[PDB]
Design a binder for this molecule. Sequence first.
Ligand SMILES: Nc1ncnc2c1ncn2[C@@H]1O[C@H](CSCC[C@H](N)C(=O)O)[C@@H](O)[C@H]1O
Ligand SMILES: Nc1ncnc2c1ncn2[C@@H]1O[C@H](CSCC[C@H](N)C(=O)O)[C@@H](O)[C@H]1O
Ligand SMILES: CO[C@H](c1ccccc1)[C@@H](O)C(=O)O
Ligand SMILES: CO[C@H](c1ccccc1)[C@@H](O)C(=O)O
Ligand SMILES: O=C(O)[C@H](O)Cc1ccccc1
Ligand SMILES: O=C(O)[C@H](O)Cc1ccccc1
Ligand SMILES: [Ca+2]
Ligand SMILES: [Ca+2]
Ligand SMILES: [Ca+2]
Ligand SMILES: [Ca+2]
Ligand SMILES: [Ca+2]
Ligand SMILES: [Ca+2]
Ligand SMILES: [Ca+2]
Ligand SMILES: [Ca+2]
Ligand SMILES: [Fe+3]
Ligand SMILES: [Fe+3]
Lengths: 333, 333
Amino acid sequence: VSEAQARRAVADIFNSTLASSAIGAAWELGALDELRENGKLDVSDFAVRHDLHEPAVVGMFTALASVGIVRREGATVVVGPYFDEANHHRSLFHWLNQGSGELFRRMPQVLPNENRTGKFYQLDAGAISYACREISERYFDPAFWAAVDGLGYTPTTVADLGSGSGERLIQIARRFPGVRGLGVDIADGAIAMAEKEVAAKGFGDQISFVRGDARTIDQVSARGEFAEVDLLTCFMMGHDFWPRENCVQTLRKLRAAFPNVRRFLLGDATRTVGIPDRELPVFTLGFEFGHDMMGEYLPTLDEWDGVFEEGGWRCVKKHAIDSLSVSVVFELE
Amino acid sequence: VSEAQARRAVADIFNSTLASSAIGAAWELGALDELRENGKLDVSDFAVRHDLHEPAVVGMFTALASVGIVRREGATVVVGPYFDEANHHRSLFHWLNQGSGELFRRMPQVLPNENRTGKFYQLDAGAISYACREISERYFDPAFWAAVDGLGYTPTTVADLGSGSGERLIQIARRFPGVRGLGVDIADGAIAMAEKEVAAKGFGDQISFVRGDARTIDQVSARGEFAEVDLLTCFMMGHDFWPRENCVQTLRKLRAAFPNVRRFLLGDATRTVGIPDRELPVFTLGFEFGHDMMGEYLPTLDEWDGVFEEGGWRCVKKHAIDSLSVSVVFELE
Ligand SMILES: Nc1ncnc2c1ncn2[C@@H]1O[C@H](CSCC[C@H](N)C(=O)O)[C@@H](O)[C@H]1O
Ligand SMILES: Nc1ncnc2c1ncn2[C@@H]1O[C@H](CSCC[C@H](N)C(=O)O)[C@@H](O)[C@H]1O
Ligand SMILES: CO[C@H](c1ccccc1)[C@@H](O)C(=O)O
Ligand SMILES: CO[C@H](c1ccccc1)[C@@H](O)C(=O)O
Ligand SMILES: O=C(O)[C@H](O)Cc1ccccc1
Ligand SMILES: O=C(O)[C@H](O)Cc1ccccc1
Ligand SMILES: [Ca+2]
Ligand SMILES: [Ca+2]
Ligand SMILES: [Ca+2]
Ligand SMILES: [Ca+2]
Ligand SMILES: [Ca+2]
Ligand SMILES: [Ca+2]
Ligand SMILES: [Ca+2]
Ligand SMILES: [Ca+2]
Ligand SMILES: [Fe+3]
Ligand SMILES: [Fe+3]
């Protein structure tokens, strides 16, 4: 490269940092949805209607324009060449920045071994959960609902591990009227939110929750509620079962604790292998690098394939996800 | 563009975020310096010598590789096509990420008018100082020393506004043996660090520090020493004198409080005008957008040029900085 191409590419990397953060902000602030509707918006009017500091709004849109997501035209912002694709993945930018941004920012302090004890990094838990809700729906839904449609039976009681919001149980309950739901979650506030939402939507006597660690499900004393369960679901947390030896034991314990489960639908993103550095897709590098910074295990697709039998399960169908790195839904029984 | 081009462009945007944050980290951890000296390093060797968590180290270089700053070949990392440019500007990336990242991450919380009271954003001050030390040396020093070389007299007492770590005063004292220095800084902590630094370097009896706000310099008590000053310097903070009416009055106050000043050397970065969005150079977008988010004024070059006479000074020479957005050093008298 000439010196001028290098100048441009490095300016682009810099401005990309700001665009990236602005994608998640423009999502959260409602700008991306206004642009989808009308293909354009008026900067001052947007600022006034949302009661925002307008010079900062102008910077937000400039950042987006600097890399081609939007285009500024006098007083208006118009969708740009990368708008549909950036908007498609917005929840992943939000996860990277608003969610995980402190982690990455603190790279020089997280890498040194002497610092890697106790609480050595900070995530924004509320932000991560704001993004994960749309990730779950946008990337995992087609395959999740394809798996539900090949169950070959009508579930009667569904249990969801890492139930969070309760949203999956509510959606299963809208599709299977009078199905019962049970959500297991390790956080009493994820439980409290889920209970409110379920009641708010008129399901408080179909769906209940239990505080519980899915990794050691034998320590939860809801046997008998567990014994009713004929469908088990676990999305976006499977990798926390690892390393391999712990995963095997978690899987065996889940098999014992839900002895009437027919299908177990397990969905997660995985560590990729061998992708060339200049062709990394969206999400991959952040997911993998983040977990390596936090010291947390991330298995590959092959590692999952290789663990089910030892863990007490048989994989009878597997769905590729589009494309949240390499992500999958396994149908186990 | 095709969907493929857009897919690629949005992925690069995502990855640039991680590479961006990695530039600063790789500076601070010593990787960029090692790669500048040898053109390459060995990832495991590097991690052992620096006692870093190697999976995170690999992640760091991978980030840098994903946008062409380095290349990975087996177990080694090698300089890539944008290495010289990114290394040149590494302190700007550090400033954006390590220093200012929490500002830009919190864009959804900082933009709403109802959040904008009290402490509504958070910068990392030690990080900002670490980066500012190199920004001063790498971008400002040549114009600074040129202005010192054209003073047309030999200073006897120098005052530095926003003295920081005391480094500029130490360097002046090395240039003019026997000159006295006086640093004014608003932050007690800068005073204490500067005093320790100066004592350690042996300039304890020549350089002193007084806590005070250069925007209200008429209120700073400095044992009558201001009247002995014959050179005044102020780098990287002049924009904090603005808006214009405050700047006029601060400049008059400085003229009256340092009546024996001959030259006043003023160096700062400025707000640009009319740069096309897709042509923003490095730094420019962050510096401007950051100040707008913070609610702080940033003047253009023309605004400076047009304030001096009313403020009681004459500009007799002006130096262009090479490329820190649009930055300059004014020589005033
Ligand atoms: N070991 C564990 N046992 C139970 N819940 C867990 C867990 N590890 C994480 N969680 C919970 O699972 C959620 C992870 S996010 C996944 C949310 C949900 N499955 C969805 O598709 O949106 C959080 O609510 C967290 O509290
Ligand atoms: N109004 C004000 N009066 C005095 N010092 C100020 C100030 N606003 C900012 N500062 C100080 O200015 C320093 C800015 S960093 C710039 C440091 C130095 N002039 C250099 O070139 O390297 C900090 O220590 C901060 O405390
Ligand atoms: C908390 O959810 C996030 C997620 C994102 C994509 C796939 C799986 C999980 C992530 O921070 C996690 O590792 O659990
Ligand atoms: C703290 O120094 C920084 C700087 C960088 C370049 C030019 C001017 C100022 C910046 O955060 C500031 O506005 O004071
Ligand atoms: O090994 C696998 O590929 C999957 O884990 C599940 C599977 C196996 C065989 C046939 C279909 C699905
Ligand atoms: O107006 C200007 O450009 C500068 O602020 C100072 C200058 C003016 C005239 C000749 C030289 C320097
Ligand atoms: Ca309009
Ligand atoms: Ca464009
Ligand atoms: Ca921490
Ligand atoms: Ca791609
Ligand atoms: Ca080597
Ligand atoms: Ca390359
Ligand atoms: Ca004062
Ligand atoms: Ca002019
Ligand atoms: Fe995780
Ligand atoms: Fe500033």
